[PDB]
Amino acid sequence: KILVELAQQQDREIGDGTTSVVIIASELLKRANELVKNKIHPTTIITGFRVALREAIRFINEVLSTSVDTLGKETLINIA
Amino acid sequence: VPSNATFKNKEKPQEVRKANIIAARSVADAIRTSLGPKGMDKMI
Numbered sequence: 636k637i638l639v640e641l642a643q644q645q646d647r648e649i650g651d652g653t654t655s656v657v658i659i660a661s662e663l664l665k666r667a668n669e670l671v672k673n674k675i676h677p678t679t680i681i682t683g684f685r686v687a688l689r690e691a692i693r694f695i696n697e698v699l700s701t702s703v704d705t706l707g708k709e710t711l712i713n714i715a
Numbered sequence: 716v717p718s719n720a721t722f723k724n725k726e727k728p729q730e731v732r733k734a735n736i737i738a739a740r741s742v743a744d745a746i747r748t749s750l751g752p753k754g755m756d757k758m759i
């Protein structure tokens with residue numbers, strides 16, 4: 636029911652991405668199933684995902700592109 | 716030394732106290748894994 640409520644949640648904030656949020660969240664748990672077999676405690680697994688996320692959000696803000704682009708808009712048509 | 720003083724009767728309370736301790740320690744074993752920062756959550 637967590638991913639069921641997560642897919643219903645994604646519509647509330649952004650409104651799009653319900654397909655990508657479920658696949659990523661299911662894969663984070665899938666690969667973590669072999670990490671607990673290593674005896675690694677989840678707090679080490681959770682910290683490893685959070686420290687990598689803090690650097691991931693900052694990396695996305697560095698690689699973003701401005702909406703200016705060329706003279707004309709050429710954005711909102713491609714956004715849809 | 717034997718055969719004198721008194722002899723214990725109705726020894727079932729001795730087993731009842733053991734059955735109460737064993738059943739109480741079994742409950743304390745499930746919550747024991749949640750102790751400390753390395754503890755885990757329990758979903759019910």
Ligand SMILES: [Mg+2]
Pocket residue numbers: 651652
């Ligand atoms: Mg979409």
